[PDB]
């Protein structure tokens, strides 16, 4: 399925080349511009654990998730990955725990040492 495919066929987008964050572009977005550091970014997403269970979804909440890019307001894989996206892009990200929740995990449903799968849509970005 899609997690296996990004694991085996994804591109390493880490600056250290440690394969901690792998990406596939699923829907090509608009133009060439990506957000810059500090921009307000608006995403839709769904996340799954490596046991197959959904752990989160903005679609199910009927509202996007909004954060300022490159500020550590989200897991490292998201700061790194969303920074590569175009407006309108949909991607898959495969995130090793060092770029996610590490040994701590995150209650209620993310265990320790968890590799995570996300589908992310970059809806919009704007400077403040």
JSON list of C-alpha atoms in Angstrom, two decimals:
[
{"chain": "A", "resi": 1, "resn": "UNK", "atom": "CA", "xyz": [0.00, 0.00, 0.00]},
{"chain": "A", "resi": 2, "resn": "UNK", "atom": "CA", "xyz": [0.95, 3.65, 0.05]},
{"chain": "A", "resi": 3, "resn": "UNK", "atom": "CA", "xyz": [3.16, 3.42, 3.21]},
{"chain": "A", "resi": 4, "resn": "UNK", "atom": "CA", "xyz": [5.15, 0.56, 1.74]},
{"chain": "A", "resi": 5, "resn": "UNK", "atom": "CA", "xyz": [5.50, 2.43, -1.57]},
{"chain": "A", "resi": 6, "resn": "UNK", "atom": "CA", "xyz": [6.89, 5.63, -0.01]},
{"chain": "A", "resi": 7, "resn": "UNK", "atom": "CA", "xyz": [9.21, 3.50, 2.20]},
{"chain": "A", "resi": 8, "resn": "UNK", "atom": "CA", "xyz": [10.67, 1.76, -0.87]},
{"chain": "A", "resi": 9, "resn": "UNK", "atom": "CA", "xyz": [10.28, 4.39, -3.59]},
{"chain": "A", "resi": 10, "resn": "UNK", "atom": "CA", "xyz": [10.43, 7.75, -1.77]},
{"chain": "A", "resi": 11, "resn": "UNK", "atom": "CA", "xyz": [13.04, 10.46, -2.08]},
{"chain": "A", "resi": 12, "resn": "UNK", "atom": "CA", "xyz": [15.19, 11.41, 0.88]},
{"chain": "A", "resi": 13, "resn": "UNK", "atom": "CA", "xyz": [14.58, 15.11, 1.52]},
{"chain": "A", "resi": 14, "resn": "UNK", "atom": "CA", "xyz": [16.77, 15.42, 4.63]},
{"chain": "A", "resi": 15, "resn": "UNK", "atom": "CA", "xyz": [19.79, 17.71, 4.56]},
{"chain": "A", "resi": 16, "resn": "UNK", "atom": "CA", "xyz": [21.81, 15.01, 6.34]},
{"chain": "A", "resi": 17, "resn": "UNK", "atom": "CA", "xyz": [20.89, 12.33, 3.77]},
{"chain": "A", "resi": 18, "resn": "UNK", "atom": "CA", "xyz": [19.95, 9.95, 6.55]},
{"chain": "A", "resi": 19, "resn": "UNK", "atom": "CA", "xyz": [16.71, 8.79, 4.86]},
{"chain": "A", "resi": 20, "resn": "UNK", "atom": "CA", "xyz": [14.74, 10.02, 7.94]},
{"chain": "A", "resi": 21, "resn": "UNK", "atom": "CA", "xyz": [12.08, 11.71, 5.83]},
{"chain": "A", "resi": 22, "resn": "UNK", "atom": "CA", "xyz": [11.09, 10.18, 2.46]},
{"chain": "A", "resi": 23, "resn": "UNK", "atom": "CA", "xyz": [8.70, 11.91, 0.07]},
{"chain": "A", "resi": 24, "resn": "UNK", "atom": "CA", "xyz": [6.55, 11.14, -3.00]},
{"chain": "A", "resi": 25, "resn": "UNK", "atom": "CA", "xyz": [4.72, 13.95, -4.82]},
{"chain": "A", "resi": 26, "resn": "UNK", "atom": "CA", "xyz": [1.21, 12.58, -5.47]},
{"chain": "A", "resi": 27, "resn": "UNK", "atom": "CA", "xyz": [-0.46, 15.66, -7.00]},
{"chain": "A", "resi": 28, "resn": "UNK", "atom": "CA", "xyz": [1.67, 18.30, -8.61]},
{"chain": "A", "resi": 29, "resn": "UNK", "atom": "CA", "xyz": [0.99, 21.83, -7.34]},
{"chain": "A", "resi": 30, "resn": "UNK", "atom": "CA", "xyz": [1.11, 25.33, -8.81]},
{"chain": "A", "resi": 31, "resn": "UNK", "atom": "CA", "xyz": [4.13, 27.10, -10.19]},
{"chain": "A", "resi": 32, "resn": "UNK", "atom": "CA", "xyz": [7.54, 26.84, -8.62]},
{"chain": "A", "resi": 33, "resn": "UNK", "atom": "CA", "xyz": [7.30, 28.76, -5.35]},
{"chain": "A", "resi": 34, "resn": "UNK", "atom": "CA", "xyz": [7.51, 26.99, -1.99]},
{"chain": "A", "resi": 35, "resn": "UNK", "atom": "CA", "xyz": [6.70, 28.72, 1.34]},
{"chain": "A", "resi": 36, "resn": "UNK", "atom": "CA", "xyz": [9.39, 30.50, 3.26]},
{"chain": "A", "resi": 37, "resn": "UNK", "atom": "CA", "xyz": [10.39, 30.31, 6.86]},
{"chain": "A", "resi": 38, "resn": "UNK", "atom": "CA", "xyz": [7.86, 31.91, 9.13]},
{"chain": "A", "resi": 39, "resn": "UNK", "atom": "CA", "xyz": [4.99, 31.80, 6.66]},
{"chain": "A", "resi": 40, "resn": "UNK", "atom": "CA", "xyz": [1.53, 30.82, 7.91]},
{"chain": "A", "resi": 41, "resn": "UNK", "atom": "CA", "xyz": [0.88, 27.50, 6.15]},
{"chain": "A", "resi": 42, "resn": "UNK", "atom": "CA", "xyz": [-2.50, 25.82, 5.83]},
{"chain": "A", "resi": 43, "resn": "UNK", "atom": "CA", "xyz": [-2.54, 22.04, 5.35]},
{"chain": "A", "resi": 44, "resn": "UNK", "atom": "CA", "xyz": [-4.93, 19.16, 5.20]},
{"chain": "A", "resi": 45, "resn": "UNK", "atom": "CA", "xyz": [-3.50, 15.82, 6.32]},
{"chain": "A", "resi": 46, "resn": "UNK", "atom": "CA", "xyz": [-4.07, 12.32, 7.49]},
{"chain": "A", "resi": 47, "resn": "UNK", "atom": "CA", "xyz": [-1.59, 10.26, 9.55]},
{"chain": "A", "resi": 48, "resn": "UNK", "atom": "CA", "xyz": [-1.23, 6.52, 9.97]},
{"chain": "A", "resi": 49, "resn": "UNK", "atom": "CA", "xyz": [0.87, 4.38, 12.26]},
{"chain": "A", "resi": 50, "resn": "UNK", "atom": "CA", "xyz": [2.89, 1.44, 11.03]},
{"chain": "A", "resi": 51, "resn": "UNK", "atom": "CA", "xyz": [0.15, -0.85, 12.44]},
{"chain": "A", "resi": 52, "resn": "UNK", "atom": "CA", "xyz": [-2.20, 0.60, 9.87]},
{"chain": "A", "resi": 53, "resn": "UNK", "atom": "CA", "xyz": [-4.37, 2.71, 12.13]},
{"chain": "A", "resi": 54, "resn": "UNK", "atom": "CA", "xyz": [-5.28, 6.31, 11.43]},
{"chain": "A", "resi": 55, "resn": "UNK", "atom": "CA", "xyz": [-4.14, 8.47, 14.34]},
{"chain": "A", "resi": 56, "resn": "UNK", "atom": "CA", "xyz": [-5.18, 11.94, 13.07]},
{"chain": "A", "resi": 57, "resn": "UNK", "atom": "CA", "xyz": [-6.97, 13.70, 10.22]},
{"chain": "A", "resi": 58, "resn": "UNK", "atom": "CA", "xyz": [-7.79, 17.35, 9.58]},
{"chain": "A", "resi": 59, "resn": "UNK", "atom": "CA", "xyz": [-10.35, 16.35, 7.01]},
{"chain": "A", "resi": 60, "resn": "UNK", "atom": "CA", "xyz": [-12.37, 14.66, 9.75]},
{"chain": "A", "resi": 61, "resn": "UNK", "atom": "CA", "xyz": [-12.39, 17.99, 11.66]},
{"chain": "A", "resi": 62, "resn": "UNK", "atom": "CA", "xyz": [-13.59, 20.03, 8.66]},
{"chain": "A", "resi": 63, "resn": "UNK", "atom": "CA", "xyz": [-10.81, 22.61, 9.17]},
{"chain": "A", "resi": 64, "resn": "UNK", "atom": "CA", "xyz": [-7.19, 22.83, 8.05]},
{"chain": "A", "resi": 65, "resn": "UNK", "atom": "CA", "xyz": [-4.22, 22.69, 10.37]},
{"chain": "A", "resi": 66, "resn": "UNK", "atom": "CA", "xyz": [-2.39, 26.01, 10.48]},
{"chain": "A", "resi": 67, "resn": "UNK", "atom": "CA", "xyz": [1.16, 26.63, 11.71]},
{"chain": "A", "resi": 68, "resn": "UNK", "atom": "CA", "xyz": [4.16, 28.93, 11.06]},
{"chain": "A", "resi": 69, "resn": "UNK", "atom": "CA", "xyz": [6.75, 27.10, 8.96]},
{"chain": "A", "resi": 70, "resn": "UNK", "atom": "CA", "xyz": [10.21, 26.35, 10.23]},
{"chain": "A", "resi": 71, "resn": "UNK", "atom": "CA", "xyz": [9.56, 27.19, 13.89]},
{"chain": "A", "resi": 72, "resn": "UNK", "atom": "CA", "xyz": [9.32, 23.73, 15.47]},
{"chain": "A", "resi": 73, "resn": "UNK", "atom": "CA", "xyz": [5.54, 24.01, 15.92]},
{"chain": "A", "resi": 74, "resn": "UNK", "atom": "CA", "xyz": [5.18, 20.61, 14.26]},
{"chain": "A", "resi": 75, "resn": "UNK", "atom": "CA", "xyz": [7.42, 17.56, 14.03]},
{"chain": "A", "resi": 76, "resn": "UNK", "atom": "CA", "xyz": [10.68, 18.02, 12.20]},
{"chain": "A", "resi": 77, "resn": "UNK", "atom": "CA", "xyz": [9.51, 15.96, 9.22]},
{"chain": "A", "resi": 78, "resn": "UNK", "atom": "CA", "xyz": [6.68, 18.40, 8.65]},
{"chain": "A", "resi": 79, "resn": "UNK", "atom": "CA", "xyz": [8.89, 21.52, 8.82]},
{"chain": "A", "resi": 80, "resn": "UNK", "atom": "CA", "xyz": [11.27, 19.82, 6.35]},
{"chain": "A", "resi": 81, "resn": "UNK", "atom": "CA", "xyz": [8.57, 18.35, 4.13]},
{"chain": "A", "resi": 82, "resn": "UNK", "atom": "CA", "xyz": [6.10, 21.21, 3.89]},
{"chain": "A", "resi": 83, "resn": "UNK", "atom": "CA", "xyz": [9.03, 23.51, 3.02]},
{"chain": "A", "resi": 84, "resn": "UNK", "atom": "CA", "xyz": [9.45, 21.46, -0.19]},
{"chain": "A", "resi": 85, "resn": "UNK", "atom": "CA", "xyz": [5.81, 21.74, -1.30]},
{"chain": "A", "resi": 86, "resn": "UNK", "atom": "CA", "xyz": [4.07, 23.92, -3.85]},
{"chain": "A", "resi": 87, "resn": "UNK", "atom": "CA", "xyz": [0.64, 25.41, -3.30]},
{"chain": "A", "resi": 88, "resn": "UNK", "atom": "CA", "xyz": [-1.91, 22.77, -4.24]},
{"chain": "A", "resi": 89, "resn": "UNK", "atom": "CA", "xyz": [0.59, 19.91, -3.93]},
{"chain": "A", "resi": 90, "resn": "UNK", "atom": "CA", "xyz": [-0.33, 16.64, -2.27]},
{"chain": "A", "resi": 91, "resn": "UNK", "atom": "CA", "xyz": [2.55, 14.47, -1.02]},
{"chain": "A", "resi": 92, "resn": "UNK", "atom": "CA", "xyz": [3.25, 11.40, 1.03]},
{"chain": "A", "resi": 93, "resn": "UNK", "atom": "CA", "xyz": [5.86, 11.55, 3.80]},
{"chain": "A", "resi": 94, "resn": "UNK", "atom": "CA", "xyz": [7.44, 8.57, 5.59]},
{"chain": "A", "resi": 95, "resn": "UNK", "atom": "CA", "xyz": [8.92, 9.84, 8.85]},
{"chain": "A", "resi": 96, "resn": "UNK", "atom": "CA", "xyz": [11.34, 7.93, 11.05]},
{"chain": "A", "resi": 97, "resn": "UNK", "atom": "CA", "xyz": [10.95, 8.64, 14.80]},
{"chain": "A", "resi": 98, "resn": "UNK", "atom": "CA", "xyz": [13.99, 10.96, 14.93]},
{"chain": "A", "resi": 99, "resn": "UNK", "atom": "CA", "xyz": [12.00, 13.34, 12.70]},
{"chain": "A", "resi": 100, "resn": "UNK", "atom": "CA", "xyz": [8.71, 12.70, 14.57]},
{"chain": "A", "resi": 101, "resn": "UNK", "atom": "CA", "xyz": [8.01, 11.86, 18.24]},
{"chain": "A", "resi": 102, "resn": "UNK", "atom": "CA", "xyz": [11.18, 9.89, 19.04]},
{"chain": "A", "resi": 103, "resn": "UNK", "atom": "CA", "xyz": [11.35, 7.62, 22.05]},
{"chain": "A", "resi": 104, "resn": "UNK", "atom": "CA", "xyz": [8.75, 9.68, 23.88]},
{"chain": "A", "resi": 105, "resn": "UNK", "atom": "CA", "xyz": [5.88, 9.02, 21.56]},
{"chain": "A", "resi": 106, "resn": "UNK", "atom": "CA", "xyz": [2.73, 11.14, 21.89]},
{"chain": "A", "resi": 107, "resn": "UNK", "atom": "CA", "xyz": [-0.39, 10.24, 23.77]},
{"chain": "A", "resi": 108, "resn": "UNK", "atom": "CA", "xyz": [-2.96, 9.01, 23.17]},
{"chain": "A", "resi": 109, "resn": "UNK", "atom": "CA", "xyz": [-2.03, 6.91, 20.17]},
{"chain": "A", "resi": 110, "resn": "UNK", "atom": "CA", "xyz": [1.58, 7.37, 18.96]},
{"chain": "A", "resi": 111, "resn": "UNK", "atom": "CA", "xyz": [3.91, 4.82, 20.59]},
{"chain": "A", "resi": 112, "resn": "UNK", "atom": "CA", "xyz": [7.55, 5.14, 21.36]},
{"chain": "A", "resi": 113, "resn": "UNK", "atom": "CA", "xyz": [9.94, 4.81, 18.39]},
{"chain": "A", "resi": 114, "resn": "UNK", "atom": "CA", "xyz": [7.13, 5.15, 15.80]},
{"chain": "A", "resi": 115, "resn": "UNK", "atom": "CA", "xyz": [7.64, 5.51, 12.04]},
{"chain": "A", "resi": 116, "resn": "UNK", "atom": "CA", "xyz": [4.75, 7.59, 10.71]},
{"chain": "A", "resi": 117, "resn": "UNK", "atom": "CA", "xyz": [3.04, 7.93, 7.35]},
{"chain": "A", "resi": 118, "resn": "UNK", "atom": "CA", "xyz": [1.32, 11.18, 6.28]},
{"chain": "A", "resi": 119, "resn": "UNK", "atom": "CA", "xyz": [-0.62, 12.36, 3.28]},
{"chain": "A", "resi": 120, "resn": "UNK", "atom": "CA", "xyz": [-0.34, 16.18, 3.24]},
{"chain": "A", "resi": 121, "resn": "UNK", "atom": "CA", "xyz": [-2.03, 18.78, 1.01]},
{"chain": "A", "resi": 122, "resn": "UNK", "atom": "CA", "xyz": [-0.54, 22.31, 1.07]},
{"chain": "A", "resi": 123, "resn": "UNK", "atom": "CA", "xyz": [-3.66, 24.46, 0.75]},
{"chain": "A", "resi": 124, "resn": "UNK", "atom": "CA", "xyz": [-2.09, 27.89, 1.04]},
{"chain": "A", "resi": 125, "resn": "UNK", "atom": "CA", "xyz": [0.81, 29.83, 2.46]},
{"chain": "A", "resi": 126, "resn": "UNK", "atom": "CA", "xyz": [1.22, 33.50, 3.25]},
{"chain": "A", "resi": 127, "resn": "UNK", "atom": "CA", "xyz": [3.60, 35.82, 4.90]},
{"chain": "A", "resi": 128, "resn": "UNK", "atom": "CA", "xyz": [2.41, 37.77, 7.92]}
]
